[PDB]
């Protein structure tokens with residue numbers, strides 16, 4: 001069927017929008033742009049297409065294996081209170097006279113509304129649950145042609161809290177149980193790099209590829225979503241959870257009406273809703289089922305897979321150049337029949353460093369003893385374009401980028417320097433900041449960055465040097481494109497930021513010493529941070545990182 005039908009009503013904004021920075025620094029005015037609801041119709045057309053799905057014995061066999069693996073899981077309902085605390089503080093307010101603040105504080109109006117939503121899920125398994133469709137306002141660098149806005153489709157806040165009560169515990173247990181080491185979200189960046197190097201090394205002759213599905217959410221069929229429900233139902237669950245999961249599947253996940261911000265009927269969806277709890281989990285499991293079945297259909301030899309939502313990497317035993325091309329073509333044809341055709345056809349790679357996945361590539365630099373250190377990086381154009389917009393306007397993406405890409409030269413020299421300088425000038429350094437990342441929210445105090453970085457990337461993230469020529473060229477090109485200061489200027493700025501941080505003492509001084517050790521002549525010998533050992537970041541290493549309206553925070557476990 002068609003992924004979407006449209007009434008012709010526009011995708012409308014809820015708040016005023018800006019395509020360009022106001023000329024009210026104004027050095028980036030013509031270097032950056034923001035997507036708005038004005039390009040929503042162009043995106044709507046791109047995400048609307050017919051799906052045909054033909055499954056075979058390879059798909060059937062893999063699905064039977066997943067269902068048996070899911071049978072081992074036991075999951076429980078979350079209490080209303082647990083689901084309320086997982087809700088981010090600025091999650092889109094309900095249409096029923098309450099917002100995330102009232103949800104988190106367990107106010108009478110919010111609680112009573114959520115209880116009647118839950119009761120309604122138990123009593124009615126069919127009435128379509130309305131959704132809102134919105135165009136995202138995201139920043140990119142001017143370069144072919146302006147990117148149209150991405151679209152999000154979500155149910156009301158009351159329904160979102162109910163999804164957590166029914167399925168949150170499943171999202172924390174089911175993906176690892178059915179996918180094992182293939183489940184991408186479980187790894188910190190250092191552990192992902194370790195897994196990739198190990199998978200590459202355990203091949204007699206390694207060949208790898210990334211597989212980019214064209215608009216994965218739209219390729220997800222009604223049958224794929226009802227199959228996801230049957231994988232959920234294979235778990236040992238309380239009866240109440242089974243009823244609510246079935247009702248959420250038929251009333252919301254399989255499809256339903258979409259309304260614009262004005263309350264006008266906008267369209268009808270027959271594919272994945274971008275803004276529901278099960279998007280990240282369902283995409284991960286469904287991508288995994290299709291890809292493993294396609295590996296079997298193609299004759300991919302000894303595959304090792306890594307899956308994060310719709311991002312997929314397959315590392316296997318090379319069968320020779322001609323055979324590898326033939327097997328990848330056969331892999332693409334099988335993925336196409338399963339309703340997952342590619343954007344660009346996959347290419348066999350014989351160097352792990354040449355594979356791009358989740359917009360990232362593995363790069364090499366040297367450590368304190370001149371030993372090789374592998375890390376994930378990416379083109380910094382979009383992170384730097386967003387940092388420029390957010391500095392000119394207010395406050396976010398910079399914190400998410402610092403955390404994910406802490407060992408990169410562009411984070412160390414540019415992002416870290418600029419944002420620690422802004423934090424001190426604002427005198428709002430010792431505050432927890434909330435930042436949005438793929439539909440979920442994280443609360444991090446910047447003063448805790450050294451311990452967080454050590455836990456995620458290791459102590460080598462503060463002592464890496466001799467970055468690659470490709471990496472240095474990519475960073476210098478991005479800064480030039482944006483008309484931003486070159487790398488040579490960031491060292492002098494970092495010395496000042498480091499001095500200011502040290503002069504403040506305490507945690508601020510630890511940030512100065514660890515994060516900016518690269519900027520000084522007389523390097524200190526950085527030792528492991530005892531605080532890093534106590535960190536509890538359990539929720540961070542789950543599908544919750546890829547979406548689902550989840551609030552993640554930094555906890556500290558007792559020894």
Ligand SMILES: CCN(c1cc2oc(-c3ccc(F)cc3)c(C(=O)NC)c2cc1-c1cccc(C(=O)NC2(c3ncccn3)CC2)c1)S(C)(=O)=O
Nearest residue numbers: 184189306307308311312313355357358360376404437545
């Ligand atoms: C999204 C970027 N990253 C990633 C880079 C990656 O590179 C490959 C990859 C590259 C090359 C290759 F040959 C094979 C594979 C990935 C892959 O698995 N492809 C199948 C992959 C996944 C992520 C990722 C995705 C989603 C969440 C988090 C995530 O939660 N990140 C953290 C975080 N995010 C926010 C807030 C706080 N913490 C840091 C934990 C990571 S990265 C650099 O962060 O590891």
